[PDB]
A paper describes a structure:
The TEM-1 β-lactamase model system has been extensively used to study protein evolution. β-lactamases are a class of enzymes that are produced by bacteria in order to provide resistance to bactericidal β-lactam antibiotics through hydrolysis of their core β-lactam ring. We apply EVcouplings to computationally design variants of the model protein TEM-1 β-lactamase. To examine the structural effects of these mutations, we obtained X-ray crystal structures of designs 80.a, 80.b, and 70.a. Aligning these structures in 3D to a published WT TEM-1 structure (PDB: 1XPB34) revealed that all three have nearly identical Cα backbones to WT TEM-1 (0.26–0.61 Å RMSD over all Cα atoms).
Author numbering: 28 to 238, 240 to 252, 254 to 290
Write the structure that this text describes.
Protein backbone atom coordinates (compact mmCIF):
# COMPACT_ATOMS: atom_id res chain seq x y z
CA UNK A 1 0.00 0.00 0.00
CA UNK A 2 2.88 2.41 0.65
CA UNK A 3 4.08 2.05 -2.96
CA UNK A 4 0.50 2.66 -4.12
CA UNK A 5 0.39 5.88 -2.11
CA UNK A 6 3.71 6.97 -3.61
CA UNK A 7 2.47 6.42 -7.16
CA UNK A 8 -0.77 8.29 -6.46
CA UNK A 9 1.11 11.30 -5.07
CA UNK A 10 3.45 11.27 -8.06
CA UNK A 11 0.39 11.11 -10.31
CA UNK A 12 -1.15 14.04 -8.37
CA UNK A 13 1.84 16.39 -8.07
CA UNK A 14 3.55 15.63 -11.37
CA UNK A 15 7.29 15.29 -11.68
CA UNK A 16 9.04 12.25 -10.18
CA UNK A 17 9.01 10.57 -6.76
CA UNK A 18 11.78 8.38 -5.41
CA UNK A 19 11.64 6.26 -2.28
CA UNK A 20 13.72 3.64 -0.51
CA UNK A 21 13.25 1.98 2.86
CA UNK A 22 16.19 0.03 4.23
CA UNK A 23 16.40 -2.73 6.80
CA UNK A 24 19.40 -2.03 9.00
CA UNK A 25 20.41 -5.53 10.10
CA UNK A 26 20.94 -6.72 6.53
CA UNK A 27 21.00 -3.46 4.61
CA UNK A 28 18.51 -4.92 2.18
CA UNK A 29 15.91 -2.72 0.52
CA UNK A 30 12.48 -3.48 1.94
CA UNK A 31 10.76 -1.48 -0.78
CA UNK A 32 11.59 1.31 -3.17
CA UNK A 33 10.09 3.41 -5.92
CA UNK A 34 12.31 4.70 -8.73
CA UNK A 35 15.04 3.46 -6.39
CA UNK A 36 17.83 3.57 -8.99
CA UNK A 37 16.83 6.86 -10.64
CA UNK A 38 18.86 10.00 -9.98
CA UNK A 39 17.38 12.85 -7.91
CA UNK A 40 18.96 16.15 -6.80
CA UNK A 41 20.11 15.79 -3.20
CA UNK A 42 19.65 19.44 -2.25
CA UNK A 43 20.58 19.96 1.41
CA UNK A 44 20.37 16.23 2.19
CA UNK A 45 24.01 16.18 1.00
CA UNK A 46 24.87 18.10 4.18
CA UNK A 47 24.79 14.85 6.21
CA UNK A 48 27.38 13.34 3.84
CA UNK A 49 29.42 16.52 4.11
CA UNK A 50 29.48 16.34 7.88
CA UNK A 51 30.43 12.66 7.65
CA UNK A 52 33.42 13.66 5.53
CA UNK A 53 34.35 16.29 8.13
CA UNK A 54 34.00 13.81 11.00
CA UNK A 55 36.10 11.30 9.06
CA UNK A 56 38.90 13.90 9.01
CA UNK A 57 38.32 14.55 12.71
CA UNK A 58 38.69 10.81 13.30
CA UNK A 59 41.97 10.75 11.35
CA UNK A 60 43.50 13.68 13.25
CA UNK A 61 43.18 15.89 10.16
CA UNK A 62 40.61 18.24 11.73
CA UNK A 63 39.38 19.44 15.13
CA UNK A 64 35.76 20.01 16.11
CA UNK A 65 36.74 23.15 18.06
CA UNK A 66 38.85 24.80 15.35
CA UNK A 67 37.47 28.28 14.64
CA UNK A 68 36.69 29.25 11.03
CA UNK A 69 36.71 32.99 10.31
CA UNK A 70 34.66 34.43 7.46
CA UNK A 71 33.18 37.72 6.30
CA UNK A 72 29.84 39.03 5.10
CA UNK A 73 31.06 38.48 1.54
CA UNK A 74 31.08 34.71 2.11
CA UNK A 75 27.37 34.63 2.96
CA UNK A 76 24.99 33.07 0.45
CA UNK A 77 21.19 33.00 0.57
CA UNK A 78 19.65 31.33 3.64
CA UNK A 79 22.36 31.56 6.30
CA UNK A 80 20.29 31.98 9.48
CA UNK A 81 23.13 31.05 11.87
CA UNK A 82 26.34 32.02 10.08
CA UNK A 83 25.01 35.51 9.35
CA UNK A 84 25.00 36.15 13.13
CA UNK A 85 28.69 35.21 13.57
CA UNK A 86 30.53 37.05 10.81
CA UNK A 87 32.28 38.81 13.69
CA UNK A 88 33.37 36.04 16.06
CA UNK A 89 33.61 33.20 13.49
CA UNK A 90 32.38 29.66 14.29
CA UNK A 91 33.96 26.34 15.14
CA UNK A 92 33.85 23.31 12.83
CA UNK A 93 31.35 21.66 15.21
CA UNK A 94 29.11 24.74 15.30
CA UNK A 95 29.14 24.89 11.49
CA UNK A 96 28.13 21.22 11.22
CA UNK A 97 25.34 21.79 13.75
CA UNK A 98 24.17 24.80 11.72
CA UNK A 99 24.38 22.92 8.40
CA UNK A 100 22.40 19.90 9.64
CA UNK A 101 20.05 21.45 12.21
CA UNK A 102 19.08 24.63 10.34
CA UNK A 103 20.35 23.75 6.83
CA UNK A 104 22.54 26.87 6.89
CA UNK A 105 23.97 27.30 3.40
CA UNK A 106 27.12 29.28 4.19
CA UNK A 107 27.94 26.76 6.93
CA UNK A 108 27.95 24.04 4.25
CA UNK A 109 30.15 26.07 1.89
CA UNK A 110 32.56 26.81 4.74
CA UNK A 111 32.75 23.09 5.55
CA UNK A 112 33.12 22.20 1.87
CA UNK A 113 36.21 24.43 1.78
CA UNK A 114 37.70 22.62 4.78
CA UNK A 115 37.62 19.28 2.92
CA UNK A 116 38.59 20.45 -0.58
CA UNK A 117 35.26 21.18 -2.29
CA UNK A 118 32.49 19.16 -3.91
CA UNK A 119 35.05 16.98 -5.73
CA UNK A 120 36.56 15.93 -2.39
CA UNK A 121 33.11 15.03 -1.04
CA UNK A 122 32.55 12.82 -4.08
CA UNK A 123 35.98 11.25 -3.56
CA UNK A 124 35.18 10.53 0.10
CA UNK A 125 31.98 8.83 -1.03
CA UNK A 126 33.84 6.74 -3.60
CA UNK A 127 36.28 5.76 -0.87
CA UNK A 128 33.45 4.19 1.20
CA UNK A 129 31.83 2.31 -1.67
CA UNK A 130 29.25 4.77 -3.02
CA UNK A 131 29.86 4.85 -6.78
CA UNK A 132 26.61 6.71 -7.54
CA UNK A 133 26.25 9.87 -5.46
CA UNK A 134 28.02 12.98 -6.66
CA UNK A 135 28.37 16.58 -5.53
CA UNK A 136 29.57 18.99 -8.20
CA UNK A 137 28.57 22.53 -7.18
CA UNK A 138 28.43 24.78 -4.11
CA UNK A 139 25.49 26.42 -2.34
CA UNK A 140 23.25 27.57 -3.75
CA UNK A 141 23.73 26.47 -7.38
CA UNK A 142 23.60 22.77 -6.48
CA UNK A 143 19.81 23.21 -5.94
CA UNK A 144 19.10 24.05 -9.60
CA UNK A 145 17.56 20.62 -10.30
CA UNK A 146 17.73 20.79 -14.09
CA UNK A 147 15.84 17.86 -15.66
CA UNK A 148 18.18 14.99 -16.50
CA UNK A 149 21.17 16.81 -14.97
CA UNK A 150 23.39 14.30 -13.10
CA UNK A 151 25.30 16.97 -11.14
CA UNK A 152 24.64 16.98 -7.38
CA UNK A 153 22.46 13.85 -7.52
CA UNK A 154 22.00 10.56 -5.71
CA UNK A 155 19.57 7.65 -6.06
CA UNK A 156 17.18 6.72 -3.22
CA UNK A 157 18.82 3.28 -2.83
CA UNK A 158 22.39 4.60 -3.03
CA UNK A 159 21.70 7.38 -0.51
CA UNK A 160 20.08 4.82 1.82
CA UNK A 161 23.08 2.51 1.54
CA UNK A 162 25.56 5.32 2.22
CA UNK A 163 23.60 6.61 5.19
CA UNK A 164 23.66 3.13 6.76
CA UNK A 165 27.44 2.96 6.38
CA UNK A 166 27.78 6.41 7.99
CA UNK A 167 25.16 6.24 10.78
CA UNK A 168 25.59 2.56 11.72
CA UNK A 169 28.63 1.18 9.87
CA UNK A 170 32.32 1.68 10.56
CA UNK A 171 33.13 4.68 8.34
CA UNK A 172 33.25 6.77 11.53
CA UNK A 173 34.15 5.99 15.12
CA UNK A 174 31.15 5.36 17.41
CA UNK A 175 31.67 8.80 19.02
CA UNK A 176 31.64 10.55 15.63
CA UNK A 177 28.84 8.33 14.31
CA UNK A 178 26.66 9.31 17.29
CA UNK A 179 27.64 12.96 16.86
CA UNK A 180 26.22 12.81 13.33
CA UNK A 181 23.01 11.14 14.53
CA UNK A 182 22.69 13.65 17.37
CA UNK A 183 22.85 16.60 14.97
CA UNK A 184 20.20 14.95 12.78
CA UNK A 185 18.04 14.31 15.85
CA UNK A 186 18.24 18.06 16.53
CA UNK A 187 16.86 19.00 13.06
CA UNK A 188 14.78 22.18 13.52
CA UNK A 189 13.27 22.69 10.07
CA UNK A 190 11.71 19.26 9.29
CA UNK A 191 8.57 19.62 11.41
CA UNK A 192 6.00 19.52 8.60
CA UNK A 193 7.47 16.35 7.02
CA UNK A 194 7.88 12.86 8.54
CA UNK A 195 7.95 14.32 12.04
CA UNK A 196 4.34 15.49 11.69
CA UNK A 197 3.19 11.86 11.25
CA UNK A 198 5.25 10.25 14.04
CA UNK A 199 3.28 8.46 16.79
CA UNK A 200 4.29 8.93 20.40
CA UNK A 201 7.50 7.22 21.46
CA UNK A 202 9.05 7.14 17.98
CA UNK A 203 12.52 8.55 17.45
CA UNK A 204 13.85 10.21 14.30
CA UNK A 205 17.14 11.63 13.00
CA UNK A 206 16.61 13.40 9.70
CA UNK A 207 17.73 16.03 7.18
CA UNK A 208 15.58 17.81 4.60
CA UNK A 209 16.31 19.45 1.29
CA UNK A 210 14.50 21.82 -1.04
CA UNK A 211 15.36 23.01 -4.51
CA UNK A 212 14.23 24.52 -7.76
CA UNK A 213 11.61 22.96 -10.02
CA UNK A 214 9.43 21.81 -7.13
CA UNK A 215 12.14 19.74 -5.48
CA UNK A 216 12.03 18.35 -1.93
CA UNK A 217 13.64 15.48 -0.07
CA UNK A 218 14.28 13.90 3.27
CA UNK A 219 16.65 11.29 4.65
CA UNK A 220 15.80 9.74 7.97
CA UNK A 221 16.81 7.19 10.56
CA UNK A 222 13.64 6.44 12.52
CA UNK A 223 12.01 3.72 14.59
CA UNK A 224 9.14 2.73 16.90
CA UNK A 225 9.63 2.72 20.67
CA UNK A 226 11.27 -0.53 21.70
CA UNK A 227 11.95 -1.68 18.14
CA UNK A 228 14.73 -1.53 15.56
CA UNK A 229 14.96 1.56 13.32
CA UNK A 230 15.01 1.76 9.54
CA UNK A 231 16.39 4.26 7.03
CA UNK A 232 14.02 5.98 4.62
CA UNK A 233 14.84 8.41 1.85
CA UNK A 234 12.27 10.29 -0.21
CA UNK A 235 12.98 12.65 -3.10
CA UNK A 236 10.70 14.55 -5.41
CA UNK A 237 11.53 16.80 -8.34
CA UNK A 238 9.85 18.28 -11.40
CA UNK A 239 6.42 19.35 -10.09
CA UNK A 240 4.82 22.80 -9.72
CA UNK A 241 3.91 22.14 -6.05
CA UNK A 242 4.75 24.77 -3.42
CA UNK A 243 6.74 23.98 -0.28
CA UNK A 244 3.60 23.19 1.72
CA UNK A 245 2.38 20.70 -0.92
CA UNK A 246 5.84 19.16 -1.08
CA UNK A 247 5.84 18.88 2.72
CA UNK A 248 2.39 17.27 2.72
CA UNK A 249 3.40 14.68 0.13
CA UNK A 250 6.42 13.59 2.14
CA UNK A 251 4.38 13.53 5.36
CA UNK A 252 1.75 11.37 3.65
CA UNK A 253 4.43 8.90 2.53
CA UNK A 254 5.77 8.96 6.08
CA UNK A 255 2.34 8.22 7.52
CA UNK A 256 1.89 5.29 5.10
CA UNK A 257 5.24 3.64 5.80
CA UNK A 258 4.56 4.18 9.50
CA UNK A 259 1.09 2.62 9.28
CA UNK A 260 2.54 -0.34 7.36
CA UNK A 261 5.71 -0.77 9.45
Amino acid sequence: ETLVTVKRIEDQLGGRLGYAELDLGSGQVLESYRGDERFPMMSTFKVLLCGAVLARVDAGQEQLDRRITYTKADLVTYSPVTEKHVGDGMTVAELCEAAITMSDNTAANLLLTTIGGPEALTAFLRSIGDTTTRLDRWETELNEALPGDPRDTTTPEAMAATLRKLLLGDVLTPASRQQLIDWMEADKVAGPLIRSALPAGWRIADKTGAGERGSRGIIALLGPPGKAPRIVVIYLTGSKADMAERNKAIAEIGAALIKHW
